[PDB]
Design a protein around this ligand. Structure first.
Ligand SMILES: CCCCCCCCCCCCCCCCCC(=O)OC[C@H](COP(=O)([O-])OCC(O)COP(=O)([O-])OC[C@@H](COC(=O)CCCCCCCCCCCCCCCCC)OC(=O)CCCCCCCCCCCCCCCCC)OC(=O)CCCCCCCCCCCCCCCCC
Ligand SMILES: CCCCCCCCCCCCCCCCCC(=O)OC[C@H](COP(=O)([O-])OCC(O)COP(=O)([O-])OC[C@@H](COC(=O)CCCCCCCCCCCCCCCCC)OC(=O)CCCCCCCCCCCCCCCCC)OC(=O)CCCCCCCCCCCCCCCCC
Ligand SMILES: CCCCCCCCCCCCCCCCCC(=O)OC[C@H](COP(=O)([O-])OCC(O)COP(=O)([O-])OC[C@@H](COC(=O)CCCCCCCCCCCCCCCCC)OC(=O)CCCCCCCCCCCCCCCCC)OC(=O)CCCCCCCCCCCCCCCCC
Ligand SMILES: CCCCCCCCCCCCCCCCCC(=O)OC[C@H](COP(=O)([O-])OCC(O)COP(=O)([O-])OC[C@@H](COC(=O)CCCCCCCCCCCCCCCCC)OC(=O)CCCCCCCCCCCCCCCCC)OC(=O)CCCCCCCCCCCCCCCCC
Ligand SMILES: CCCCCCCCCCCCCCCCC[C@@H](O)O[C@H](CO[C@H](O)CCCCCCCCCCCCCCC)COP(=O)(O)OCC[N+](C)(C)C
Ligand SMILES: CCCCCCCCCCCCCCCCC[C@@H](O)O[C@H](CO[C@H](O)CCCCCCCCCCCCCCC)COP(=O)(O)OCC[N+](C)(C)C
Ligand SMILES: CCCCCCCCCCCCCCCCC[C@@H](O)O[C@H](CO[C@H](O)CCCCCCCCCCCCCCC)COP(=O)(O)OCC[N+](C)(C)C
Ligand SMILES: CCCCCCCC/C=C\CCCCCCCC(=O)OC[C@H](COP(=O)(O)OCCN)OC(=O)CCCCCCC/C=C\CCCCCCCC
Lengths: 55, 44, 140, 49, 175, 115, 122, 347, 98
């Protein structure tokens, strides 16, 4: 219950699962430049509003 | 008695287009052995 | 904008719980709107109505988390008469994590979020109290 | 033994070997002379000897 | 204030930019860029830069001719799109027109900092210099100084143009 | 101001000519009359289909050569500088590289139309 | 963020100013030079290994050139590094001397007259 | 491509970078960037195929957009101060636009999307050039305007680059995409310390370039672009796989290897500015890069994968072309930690 | 600043948005890029004329020159893309993923 299951569950297995899910989310881009450049426009607007308005 | 070494079943885990295949990414194919895709029959 | 952060932080800890909850709701809604914008850009929804539905889902989830966190933290601060105590932020963050788990309808996500958001909020409270700097200025 | 050209034969390329050894010797002599001059200039500037 | 001719020309500049940025068929986008180039030439001429405006107009006329040929070769379809044949194109066009109208209104009726700084209006004529001298054009002198002051610029520009010829030769080689 | 009036006058005259052309005569328009012309017969395909360009490389080269025109038109004013030796060297240098780029494209079969 | 590039009187690309000649040059048995020569020797051994040559015996002239090049570069590298550290300390001392009000010399108390809190371990 | 034309194009790329790094005028820096891009496009397409053409098109679109933004920032700065000298931007809006343009040129998150694809679409030599030489000019410009940068935006982009590099590299079986995600993470590390100390940025750049050159040369030597192709190298050249494993350990930052020296120097520097949370997060996130390096080392050198029969024929032939600087590159990529104080020569 | 400066800056912003928001044709994006170059030319020319900085009267021309290079470069790439697919659609450039 403790060594083989829950101590595994909390520290190492949770870390592995979270990193794998984040890796899948980050790397699954279809390679279409339309989506990338739309995200670029969103980023440029955000940087102009949230950092450039605060100085 | 000999040390375990990877076999074909172990090696095929690294032969896909990605690690951790999902339902969306399972249809992704690995690139051609040379970096050359077959020509498309897009007759003009 | 950090103007919303100031609007939240200008009100003292255990006072005006409704206004604290409103400010935190605004911050959460802004975060959810940004998340939905990036999600729609990078993963198109194949329909306009489905994109509107996804934006509403994300923004409502984030705004609900913000409201729950702010209201719970302010109420815990005023009832216990202990402002500047990170455990109020821990309770608020863990309630927000439970709200996220309820919204996604997942017990495991609920527990993990409750713990992680509570710890993060308590850490933010400690950083506020001790003056920890995330984006340190170049002093030297 | 071998069947074909095998560009390195029993005699090594003596021009390349001579150039390599000459470069090493020139660098070593230059470094020794430079260190001697550095020591002399440092002593002259700081008035040690 | 002064007949706002330059303001009209800049508004038409923005309108042509919206015309080609809503991205209809490249035939109409090329036409919109030609209109923008002409009105930009007019804007620059109203500020004393005759040579610069005329040259940018000439350059963009040549570029749009090459673009027209390339569009006929490689960017055509069965039914080329105009600004009213597509909901997306019409929406982008109308949105650009309306947000231009909003900026113009909010800038001329009151004084606000849109993104960088503020504006009150007063027309362009205020910021002029009223200098009175010369048997030459300062713009022409500054441009002709490229052959006496700008030796380094001439060197890098000529090298880049020669390399550009070589580069376009390499890219379209195929094999 | 006078040039704007001139442009307005010319455009107005042409527009009124078009109006007269379209509103004076009797119009009897029918589908057979308005159909596309290809000398006796209905066109097989669309006229909006891709039309291949065999001089595409020369068209790209024209873009770079057209900006060489931008760099050489200030030459009449450049001849009035005091240090004529420098400007003549730079004016000649700029024409030499243009000649070399034309020579490079000519020798590498760049001026030949695609078969 | 750029500390010493704009130091006055600095020649752009010297690598070794004239004033650096006032410093004692590193000894030829400097342990840092010996480590640089060791790096050159390791490079020569790896060059033999990659080319499928007898690792220790194949190129004695080539190994010697590796060691000599590494030592030669390391000498001037050490000279420049020592000069830069000497400049740092020179500027630090001059600045402390020129700003006495920012680095005051305060009277120091003895331990018999400083009250330190005692924390028992039990 | 003709070898003379190839040499001319390479020297034009280098000349554009040198023009960027020796100019005091903003227009000449812009011209250097344009010249670099113009000569760089054909180098990516040297081996003609649809993938190379797609990579070149994506690269050109990204860099041309970045160049437009950069010229816009220059013009805004000139408008608010009649200055052409690259000292310190006088307008904060112009500074934000310039920072975004330089981040897009470098490939920092969230403008990292193009870096893997392009790196996958070109050859290994083109990837080597793209991931080593193409970083010099934007980083030099950033170093020159370091005092003007807003720390919040730059640090946000750096942290995002480290996180995204680790997460994206976790998912890759292709070696070029692994190198690209590694590059993104290292760029984040470089730009994190830029507002505090540009010498640390230069040191990190040099170390990363050395290790990247070592890895690309080792991958060209054992002509492998996938994990499974690299798993055959032990049965033909075991020394190559051993050297690759040591270099991979160095890239992960493990002491006493060289790759540890940059991070060690950066974290320490950040602690001089009362920055603890960001260095802690940065190291804990670089653990992901270490993980996928370790996975590659497992598949390549620490175990032995099955081979093929035809490999026997390859046993009878040597490598025709020899890399002169590969041994020096490996030694510099691994054994230079004891010479850490020499970094003082970089300021 | 006058309304004309903000009009030119708005033109640049519109062209940048047009470039960043893609449709099918690559030629439309190339036109947006050329429009950004045109707006930069106009803005820099207006500033240089207004401040009477004589020696930068040459920099917009040089600007134009490199604009041409980009245009030529882009058109070259477009040709190759077309020769692969028969269209200039940006959808076809999806062989490479992240
Ligand atoms: C404390 C104050 C505020 C803090 C703000 C900072 C923290 C933000 C946390 C939010 C993190 C978002 C990402 C994680 C969630 C997963 C994504 C998702 O869509 O799943 C949703 C998931 C269910 O969705 P699903 O439909 O089932 O999807 C299933 C798939 O797995 C999911 O679909 P998929 O797997 O197919 O992929 C979706 C896609 C879509 O990915 C995304 O969603 C984008 C994520 C961006 C997050 C950044 C937003 C933060 C903005 C803060 C600004 C301050 C405003 C004030 O993923 C990607 O493609 C990512 C690839 C890599 C892209 C990286 C570059 C993009 C931008 C980088 C960051 C943004 C930079 C901004 C500026 C940069 C300039 C330097 O659950 C939710 O619906 C929740 C949504 C968001 C809730 C967040 C809670 C916040 C509460 C705030 C409380 C504040 C209280 C006030 C206190 C004072
Ligand atoms: C100096 C630096 C600054 C530079 C920037 C300055 C820019 C100034 C000029 C702006 C004027 C524009 C003029 C021409 C632009 C050309 C556009 C174009 O060509 O479109 C091509 C593009 C592709 O064309 P296509 O491939 O032929 O057609 C494919 C179909 O459309 C789609 O086929 P499907 O059925 O397969 O797809 C389903 C459907 C799906 O559609 C959707 O899912 C979108 C619906 C989302 C609902 C949003 C929630 C509603 C409430 C939010 C309000 C926020 C406050 C609320 C607070 C709490 C409320 C209680 O469509 C999509 O997937 C498209 C997704 C993209 C949507 C718009 C992209 C913006 C960022 C993404 C976030 C979207 C909003 C999320 C919420 C964030 C906050 C608003 O067309 C579109 O994507 C849609 C039409 C676009 C027309 C409007 C463009 C104007 C917006 C420009 C920027 C906005 C302002 C900028 C800054 C303002 C402040 C400073
Ligand atoms: C290093 C050395 C060793 C240490 C390390 C090793 C040990 C550490 C880890 C050990 C295990 C801890 C794991 C935490 C919970 C994990 C849940 C999970 O895995 O979800 C996935 C898993 C997947 O679910 P799903 O896929 O979404 O749907 C299928 C379900 O199976 C379908 O489910 P269902 O339809 O059958 O029914 C589900 C439903 C109903 O569940 C049931 O059907 C059965 C009833 C279960 C509730 C039992 C309550 C009655 C007994 C508890 C007595 C009071 C607590 C002890 C007080 C001691 C007094 C001296 O659940 C609920 O409604 C419960 C909601 C909340 C009630 C319980 C929460 C109380 C929190 C504890 C507060 C403690 C404060 C500090 C006290 C200090 C003074 C001593 O969810 C579950 O199935 C588990 C549900 C039960 C959750 C509550 C159990 C937690 C017990 C206490 C946790 C506190 C420990 C951690 C403290 C640190 C946190 C900040
Ligand atoms: C750094 C320094 C050396 C770097 C170059 C070494 C490269 C190499 O391959 O070495 C092979 C070479 C032996 O090769 P071999 O004798 O020609 O015959 C090759 C066999 O036929 C068969 O050899 P093979 O090449 O066909 O076998 C391939 C082998 C080749 O793989 C390797 O050798 C690993 C190297 C990386 O790889 C494997 O077997 C796969 C096993 C995978 C294990 C993964 C762990 C590897 C990383 C550990 C590296 C540890 C640091 C270096 C340890 C020393 C290495 C020699 O090693 C040496 O003998 C040289 C080492 C140093 C000896 C000279 C020291 C100075 C002389 C004594 C004077 C005392 C000084 C003080 C004077 C005081 C006055 C009294
Ligand atoms: C150090 C390494 C040397 C070799 C490698 C050099 C690499 C770069 C290529 C050439 C470098 C050019 C640097 C010189 C800059 C020119 C400016 C300076 O030298 O003075 C000019 C001298 O100009 C001369 O004409 C020299 C220019 C001749 C060079 C043209 C051909 C050589 C270039 C070849 C390489 C370029 C790429 C390949 C082209 C085919 C003008 O002086 P002047 O007008 O009196 O007075 C100016 C002050 N006023 C205006 C106030 C009066
Ligand atoms: C060289 C360039 C400059 C020349 C200077 C003169 C410029 C002339 C402008 C060009 C137009 C002249 C064309 C000549 C024919 C007139 C065409 C049209 O205007 O007349 C009819 C206009 O009629 C309208 O259709 C309906 C009549 C009334 C419509 C209401 C308008 C308001 C009038 C209210 C009347 C109250 C009194 C007004 C006078 C004080 C159209 O009839 P329609 O059959 O279609 O078209 C064929 C014309 N055909 C028959 C000659 C072949
Ligand atoms: C992996 C370890 C790093 C390896 C790096 C590559 C090694 C080969 C480099 C070849 C050495 C020759 C370069 C310089 C020779 C003469 C040029 C000299 O004059 O340049 C000076 C500059 O000197 C050079 O920077 C010295 C280079 C020495 C680099 C060694 C530091 C390595 C860190 C510690 C690791 C130990 C490395 C071991 C060596 C093998 C000019 O200074 P300055 O123009 O004002 O600075 C410009 C930048 N500023 C103004 C913004 C600051
Ligand atoms: C915010 C984010 C911060 C990120 C912090 C990173 C923590 C460091 C650990 C990272 C390890 C990531 C490994 C991982 O997730 O890979 C998933 C991986 C996918 O399988 P593959 O390895 O690709 O091979 C077989 C499948 N074909 O799943 C596994 O097999 C995992 C096996 C090994 C796991 C070892 C993890 C040990 C971690 C110990 C706990 C400490 C973690 C670090 C943080 C400490 C907590 C503060």
């Amino acid at each position: 219950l403790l060594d083989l299951i829950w101590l595994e569950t909390i520290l190492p297995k949770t870390t592995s699962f979270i990193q794998m899910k984040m890796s899948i989310m980050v790397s699954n881009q279809k390679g279409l430049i339309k989506l990338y450049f739309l995200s670029f426009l969103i980023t440029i607007m955000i940087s102009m509003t949230l950092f450039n308005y605060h100085e | 008695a000999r040390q375990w070494q990877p076999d074909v079943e172990w090696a095929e885990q690294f032969g896909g287009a990605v690690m951790y295949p999902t339902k969306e990414t399972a249809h992704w194919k690995p690139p051609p052995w040379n970096d050359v895709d077959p020509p498309k029959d897009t007759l003009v | 904008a950090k103007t919303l952060l100031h609007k939240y932080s200008d009100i003292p800890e255990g006072t005006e719980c409704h206004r604290k909850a409103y400010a935190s709701t605004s911050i959460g809604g802004a975060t959810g709107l940004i998340v939905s914008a990036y999600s729609i850009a990078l993963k198109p929804p194949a329909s306009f109505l489905e994109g509107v539905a996804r934006t509403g889902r994300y923004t409502f989830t984030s705004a609900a988390i913000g409201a729950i966190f702010g209201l719970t933290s302010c109420i815990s601060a005023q009832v216990r008469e202990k402002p500047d105590d990170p455990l109020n932020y821990f309770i608020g963050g863990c309630a927000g994590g439970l709200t996220l788990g309820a919204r996604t309808r997942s017990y495991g996500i609920g527990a993990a979020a409750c713990a992680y958001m509570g710890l993060t909020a308590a850490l933010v409270k400690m950083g506020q109290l001790e003056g920890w700097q995330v984006f340190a200025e170049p002093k030297v | 033994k071998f069947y074909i050209r095998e560009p390195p034969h029993g005699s090594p390329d003596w021009l390349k070997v001579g150039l390599t050894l000459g470069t090493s010797v020139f660098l070593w002599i230059y470094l020794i002379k430079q260190h001697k001059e550095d020591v002399l200039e440092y002593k002259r500037r700081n008035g040690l000897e | 204030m002064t007949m706002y001719i330059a303001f009209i020309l800049s508004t038409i500049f923005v309108i042509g930019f919206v015309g080609f940025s809503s991205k209809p068929s490249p035939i109409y986008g090329g036409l919109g860029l030609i209109v923008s180039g002409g009105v930009g030439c007019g804007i620059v001429l109203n500020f004393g830069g005759s040579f610069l405006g005329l040259m940018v107009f000439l350059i963009y006329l040549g570029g749009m001719l090459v673009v027209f040929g390339y569009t006929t070769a490689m960017a055509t379809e069965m039914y080329p799109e105009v600004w009213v044949s597509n909901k997306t194109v019409f929406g982008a066009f109308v949105s650009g027109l309306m947000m231009e109208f909003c900026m113009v209104y909010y800038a001329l009726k009151e004084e606000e900092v849109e993104i960088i700084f503020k504006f009150n209006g007063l027309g362009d004529w205020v910021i002029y210099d009223t200098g009175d001298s010369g048997f030459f054009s300062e713009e022409a002198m500054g441009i002709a100084a490229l052959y006496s002051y700008g030796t380094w610029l001439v060197i890098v520009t000529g090298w880049s143009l020669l390399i550009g010829v070589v580069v376009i030769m390499e890219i379209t080689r195929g094999n | 101001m006078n040039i704007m009036l001139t442009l307005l006058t010319n455009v107005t005259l042409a527009s009124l000519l078009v109006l007269i052309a379209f509103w004076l005569p009797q119009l009897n328009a029918y589908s057979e009359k308005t159909s596309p012309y290809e000398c006796g017969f209905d066109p097989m395909g669309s006229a909006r289909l891709p039309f291949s360009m065999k001089f595409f490389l020369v068209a790209i080269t024209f873009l770079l050569f057209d900006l060489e025109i931008a760099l050489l038109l200030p030459l009449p004013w450049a001849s009035q500088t005091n240090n004529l030796k420098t400007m003549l060297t730079m004016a000649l240098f700029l024409l030499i590289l243009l000649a070399a780029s034309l020579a490079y494209e000519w020798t590498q079969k760049g001026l030949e139309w695609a078969e | 963020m750029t500390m010493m590039s704009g130091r006055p009187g600095r020649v752009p690309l010297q690598f070794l100013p004239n004033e650096a000649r006032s410093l004692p040059p590193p000894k030829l048995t400097d342990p840092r030079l010996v480590y640089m020569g060791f790096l050159g020797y390791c490079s020569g051994l790896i060059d033999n290994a990659i080319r499928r040559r007898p690792v220790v015996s194949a190129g004695l002239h080539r190994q010697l050139l590796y060691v000599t090049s590494f030592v030669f570069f390391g000498y001037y590298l050490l000279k420049r590094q020592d000069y830069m550290y000497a400049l740092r300390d020179h500027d630090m001392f001059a600045y402390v001397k020129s700003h006495p009000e920012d680095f005051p010399e305060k009277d120091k108390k003895t331990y018999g007259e400083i009250l330190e809190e005692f924390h028992p371990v039990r | 491509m003709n070898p003379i034309i190839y040499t001319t194009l390479i020297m034009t790329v280098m000349s554009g970078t040198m023009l960027v790094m020796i100019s005091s005028h903003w227009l000449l820096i812009w011209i250097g960037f344009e010249m670099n891009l113009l000569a760089m496009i054909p180098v990516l397409m040297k081996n003609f195929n649809p993938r190379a053409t797609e990579a070149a098109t994506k690269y050109f679109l990204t860099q041309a957009t970045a160049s437009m933004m950069l010229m816009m920032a220059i013009i805004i700065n000139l408008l608010y101060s009649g200055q052409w000298t690259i000292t310190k931007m006088f307008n904060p809006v112009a500074m934000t636009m310039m920072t975004m343009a330089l981040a897009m040129k470098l490939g920092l998150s969230p403008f990292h999307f193009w870096v893997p694809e392009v790196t996958q679409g070109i050859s290994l030599q083109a990837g080597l050039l793209l991931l080593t030489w193409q970083k010099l000019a934007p980083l030099s410009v950033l170093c020159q305007i370091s005092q003007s940068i807003n720390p919040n935006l730059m640090l946000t982009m750096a942290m995002l680059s480290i996180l995204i590099g680790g997460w994206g590299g976790l998912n890759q079986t292709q070696l070029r995409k692994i190198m690209a995600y590694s590059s993104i993470a290292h760029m984040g590390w470089m730009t994190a310390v830029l507002p505090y100390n540009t010498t640390m940025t230069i040191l990190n750049l040099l170390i990363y370039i050395t290790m990247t050159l070592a890895m690309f040369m080792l991958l060209i030597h054992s002509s492998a672009t996938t994990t499974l192709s690299l798993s055959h190298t032990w049965n033909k050249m075991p020394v190559i796989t051993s050297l690759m494993m040591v270099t991979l350990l160095s890239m992960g930052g493990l002491p006493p290897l060289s790759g540890f020296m940059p991070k060690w120097m950066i974290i320490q520097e950040m602690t001089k500015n009362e920055s603890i949370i960001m260095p802690t997060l940065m190291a804990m996130t670089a653990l992901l890069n270490l993980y996928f390096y370790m996975r590659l080392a497992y598949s390549s050198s620490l175990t032995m994968f099955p081979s093929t029969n035809n490999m026997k024929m390859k046993w009878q032939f040597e490598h025709t072309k020899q890399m002169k600087l590969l041994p020096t590159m490996i030694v510099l990529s691994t054994l230079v930690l004891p010479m850490t104080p020499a970094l003082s020569s970089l300021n | 600043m006058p309304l004309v400066y903000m009009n030119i800056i708005m033109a640049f912003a519109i062209a940048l948005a047009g470039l960043l928001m893609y449709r099918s044709h690559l030629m439309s994006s190339l036109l947006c890029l050329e429009g950004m170059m045109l707006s930069l030319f106009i803005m820099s020319t207006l500033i240089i004329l207004n401040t009477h900085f004589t020696l930068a009267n040459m920099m917009p021309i040089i600007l134009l020159v490199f604009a041409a290079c980009e245009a030529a470069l882009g058109l070259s790439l477009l040709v190759m893309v077309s020769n692969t697919y028969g269209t200039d659609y940006v959808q076809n450039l999806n062989l490479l993923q992240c």
